[PDB]
Amino acid sequence: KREHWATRLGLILAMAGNAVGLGNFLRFPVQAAENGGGAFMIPYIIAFLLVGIPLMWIEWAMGRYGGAQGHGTTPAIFYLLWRNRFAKILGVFGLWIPLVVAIYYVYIESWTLGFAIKFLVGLVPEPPTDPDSILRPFKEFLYSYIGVPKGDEPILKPSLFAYIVFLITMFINVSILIRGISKGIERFAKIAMPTLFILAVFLVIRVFLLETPNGTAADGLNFLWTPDFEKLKDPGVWIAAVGQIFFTLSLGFGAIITYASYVRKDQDIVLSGLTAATLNEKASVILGGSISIPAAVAFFGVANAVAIAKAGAFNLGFITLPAIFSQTAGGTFLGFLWFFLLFFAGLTSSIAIMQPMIAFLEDELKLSRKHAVLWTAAIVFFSAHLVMFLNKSLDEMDFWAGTIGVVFFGLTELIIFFWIFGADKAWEEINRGGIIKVPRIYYYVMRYITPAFLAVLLVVWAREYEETHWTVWITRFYIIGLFLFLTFLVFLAERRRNHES
Ligand SMILES: CCCCCCCCO[C@@H]1O[C@H](CO)[C@@H](O)[C@H](O)[C@H]1O
Ligand SMILES: CCCCCCCCO[C@@H]1O[C@H](CO)[C@@H](O)[C@H](O)[C@H]1O
Ligand SMILES: CCCCCCCCO[C@@H]1O[C@H](CO)[C@@H](O)[C@H](O)[C@H]1O
Ligand SMILES: CCCCCCCCO[C@@H]1O[C@H](CO)[C@@H](O)[C@H](O)[C@H]1O
Ligand SMILES: CCCCCCCCO[C@@H]1O[C@H](CO)[C@@H](O)[C@H](O)[C@H]1O
Ligand SMILES: CC(C)C[C@H](N)C(=O)O
Ligand SMILES: [Br-]
Ligand SMILES: [Br-]
Ligand SMILES: [Br-]
Ligand SMILES: [Br-]
Ligand SMILES: [Br-]
Ligand SMILES: [Br-]
Ligand code: NA
Ligand code: NA
């Protein structure tokens, strides 16, 4: 007795909503520009074929396998694949990663809502040609919303509107998640994914019509899709690319796995998986990449775009792009569409990374969905205060959980499933129910190329990448405590298990 996806389409759209989020529209544009445009597009594609696709199939398999036995989370699932105590411990990262990521992700997701509400109502800055005179009012606007430190103190000071909108955002996440898999996440995916797509396509079209003295949107596209084989030898290009592949595909977050545990034992994962991965890549390389960069390039030429890209993650999407839109007509409504697009793109993703925790409390602590959802909401809402109030706390969570964490966790889930659990049993399991079959070549990729590929990166990472403030220790301290709290629950679960047995 376990919730299941009602419909094939509902399932595919929920898994595409999982993947397609603030990642395709905020991160991808920046990552692609920072690393030389078309330069970044070669390693990004190979990373999709050698890491994204195999890992996407592996996670679906693991999740579906688990769900057939009533287990949607990695501490349970890892233990099934590998009957070892250390399998439960390693499996804890599959609750910790999505949880930590959720803590800052839902906060950023709320900004987009707040901005949308202000653009719609026209409570946005009125810029007075001087590039800085147009950018400044918007930089000031975001800065008041999140409360960027004016002094030396590493202290943020969210506006009350910002803060209340985070309550509303949390409330909307819960109101979906509390309704469950089919009547909440699946009903929501069916509405949001179309809406999202139509919004994107409209903004893409509206952006190609941009032409100024400094360029056109067509300039931005060229920059984006013009090879530069002289970066290929840079580790920093491939790192960025692979890293992007993880975040973007939601790989390593334990989220694909949990969603898959609601797929019926017999249902197909091979085609379904490949479709959701492909929908993601389309959504970023066609939609996400054709908005921010072309628009900045049209207004500032190329050099200045890359300069803005390098500036910050949130500069382009929260300051530059709205500043640009303010300089075209029906621009304020253009910004509304942009933030309303980001909000739906974050909302369908944030409910995905909150579900592993909910699934754990329901599956292992036998909690009711209503309680599992409220308690998880409590933990996320509470811990998020660290992200709202402590400068660079978001950066530190993003680093350990959403950067290092997911890669190490991708490699871990593959070794366990495909080496420890057994490469052939893995392969069999992946293909069972399959409408199509995984191409035979991917058996060797999955077993040798993929884990190798990752192991190499993960080494160059720990080696080539003390120079931080002391407040980083407040965040690290707290997220280590989160890991222990989760280990403790895993402990409590295996015990209730010993007694129910
Ligand atoms: C006899 C059943 C087969 C063994 C696997 C079922 C239990 C999975 O294993 C354990 O279950 C706990 C919940 O019960 C999880 O929270 C633990 O993390 C996991 O250790
Ligand atoms: C459950 C966790 C609560 C811990 C303390 C939270 C205090 C937040 O409180 C609110 O923060 C806002 C944002 O700046 C302010 O605008 C409000 O005036 C303030 O009351
Ligand atoms: C979707 C509804 C959101 C309601 C939140 C409103 C937050 C109130 O915030 C207040 O708004 C005033 C007017 O702008 C300001 O002048 C106040 O200083 C500010 O604290
Ligand atoms: C060392 C022994 C560990 C005991 C801690 C138990 C964890 C509490 O957990 C509870 O256990 C119950 C019993 O089945 C379940 O019915 C509840 O739903 C569950 O939340
Ligand atoms: C470790 C994370 C800390 C979260 C607790 C934040 C406590 C906020 O506290 C309140 O915040 C308001 C908004 O800036 C201020 O106006 C109040 O003076 C302040 O007391
Ligand atoms: C944390 C994940 C849900 C992130 C999502 N894959 C995105 O790119 O936004
Ligand atoms: Br992407
Ligand atoms: Br970024
Ligand atoms: Br504000
Ligand atoms: Br200080
Ligand atoms: Br307008
Ligand atoms: Br309960
Ligand atoms: Na999404
Ligand atoms: Na994505």
- Kindly report the backbone phi and psi dihedral angles of residue 174, in degrees, each rounded to the nearest multiple of 5, phi listed first: -70, -45
This PDB structure is determined at a resolution in Å of 3.0
Residue 387 CA to ligand 3 centre (angstroms): 21
* Residue 246 Cα to chain centre, angstroms: 8
Q: Which ligand 1 atom is at minimum distance from the Cα of 92? A: 18
Mutation pick for ligand 4 pocket among 362, 366, 485, 491 (CB with most ligand atoms within 8 Å): 366
- Kindly report the backbone phi and psi dihedral angles of residue 361, in degrees, each rounded to the nearest multiple of 5, phi listed first: -60, -40
Number of domains in the chain: 1
Residue 164 CA to ligand 9 centre (angstroms): 10
Mutation pick for ligand 2 pocket among 103, 163, 388, 390 (CB with most ligand atoms within 8 Å): 163
Contacts 24+ apart (CB under 8 A), 148-155: 148/391, 149/391, 154/390, 154/391, 154/392, 154/469, 154/471, 155/389, 155/390, 155/391
The DSSP result for 324-337, as a single string, is: HHTTSTTHHHHHHH
| Residue whose structure tokens are 């999955």 | 446
The DSSP result for 372-390, as a single string, is: HHHHHHHHHHHHHHHHHHB
Residue 280 CA to ligand 7 centre (angstroms): 8
Q: Write the residue with the smallest CA distance to atom 3 of ligand 6.
A: 349
Q: How many CA atoms lie within 13 A of 222 on its CB side?
A: 9
The C-alpha atoms of residue 132 and residue 337 are separated, in whole angstroms, by: 24
The C-alpha atoms of residue 269 and residue 320 are separated, in whole angstroms, by: 40
Where helices occur in 178-269 by DSSP H, the ranges are 187-208, 217-224, 235-249, 255-260
- Kindly report the backbone phi and psi dihedral angles of residue 212, in degrees, each rounded to the nearest multiple of 5, phi listed first: -130, -175
For residue 282, with 0-12 CB atoms within 10 Å meaning exposed, 13-18 middle and 19 or more buried, which class applies? middle
For residue 377, with 0-12 CB atoms within 10 Å meaning exposed, 13-18 middle and 19 or more buried, which class applies? buried
Do 2 and 202 contact (CB within 8 A), yes or no?
Answer: no
Where helices occur in 250-390 by DSSP H, the ranges are 255-260, 270-282, 292-311, 315, 321-325, 331-363, 369-389
Nearest ligand to the CA atom of 167:
3
389 lines ligand 5 (CB under 6 A): yes
Q: Is the dihedral of CA 227, 34, 239, 290 positive or negative?
A: negative
3-state secondary structure of 178: coil
Nearest ligand to the CA atom of 381:
2
Residue 289 CA to ligand 7 centre (angstroms): 9
Q: Write the residue with the smallest CA distance to atom 20 of ligand 2.
A: 160
3-state secondary structure of 320: helix
Nearest ligand to the CA atom of 499:
4
The C-alpha atoms of residue 106 and residue 346 are separated, in whole angstroms, by: 8
Encoded tokens for 449: 């190329």
Which domain, by its residues, includes 345?
Answer: 1-501
Q: Write the residue with the smallest CA distance to atom 15 of ligand 2.
A: 160
Query: What angle (nearest 5°) sits at the alpha carbon of residue 350, between those of residues 348 and 351?
Result: 70
The C-alpha atoms of residue 486 and residue 476 are separated, in whole angstroms, by: 15
Q: Which ligand 5 atom is at minimum distance from the Cα of 390? A: 2
The C-alpha atoms of residue 356 and residue 368 are separated, in whole angstroms, by: 14
Q: Is 85 annotated as a binding residue?
A: yes
